């Protein structure tokens with residue numbers, strides 16, 4: 001850790017240990033304010049999968065997206081001081097609670113889409129909870145849409161069918177991932193479960209089903225919203241605006257004791 005960081009910040013324990021970065025909690029010495037420190041290891045050769053994610057982060061300012069406070073660039077790694085969300089991810093209850101979560105998620109997705117940004121890795125692990133409100137994070141896979149995209153990326157559970165097809169995709173792959181998440185929030189398991197290729201062939205059909213007994217006491221409005229969010233026809237599929245105008249975003253759920261089993 002370089003002296004430039006420690007002069008102003010006090011790095012602490014590790015709260016995020018992915019394969020692509022390290023996150024730690026830290027305190028600004030001047031103001032005794034908590035923040036998060038993202039440490040991104042650079043390639044041993046002296047670069048654009050890091051710079052791009054930073055270029056994205058300098059443009060995003062929304063109450064439902066983890067905020068970039070400041071950045072320090074160093075030869076071996078790049079240090080990002082970001083806002084700290086102390087609640088944990090989506091894993092860490094009612095249709096009323098879940099509907100507010102999609103509202104936060106769709107407000108972020110709507111904001112990003114106005115800047116032609118596609119997140120391409122929206123999943124529960126990348127959604128953080130303030131004590132509830134959600135905040136979207138990890139813009140490593142985000143990119144600006146200037147044309148159809150053909151790169152297959154993201155965790156296969158939340159990947160849209162047109163990504164699997166490799167025919168071209170765009171801004172509406174984030175609505176699909178949000179639909180899968182909302183589906184999970186209501187019953188605790190994913191719409192397409194598979195049995196590696198079986199999952200891909202299942203998603204490509206796009207048969208969203210609400211089985212019994214889990215989906216019996218969930219409103220038809222949520223079913224209608226989820227079905228419109230998970231439409232294989234991209235043109236028909238809902239936009240972030242269409243999701244936010246839906247009445248379900250504007251009854252206890254037996255969901256936890258099954259999220260721990262499936263994930």
Ligand SMILES: CCN1C(=O)c2ccccc2N(C)c2nc(Nc3ccc(N4CCN(C)CC4)cc3OC)ncc21
Nearest residue numbers: 015016023036038082083084085086088125126137138
């Ligand atoms: C650099 C900014 N940032 C992201 O960009 C970010 C984006 C996506 C995912 C994780 C991120 N990291 C790690 C972030 N994680 C958090 N918060 C957070 C999270 C988890 C925990 N625990 C750790 C201990 N185990 C046992 C329970 C959970 C504790 C946390 O805060 C105290 N606030 C901001 C993040």
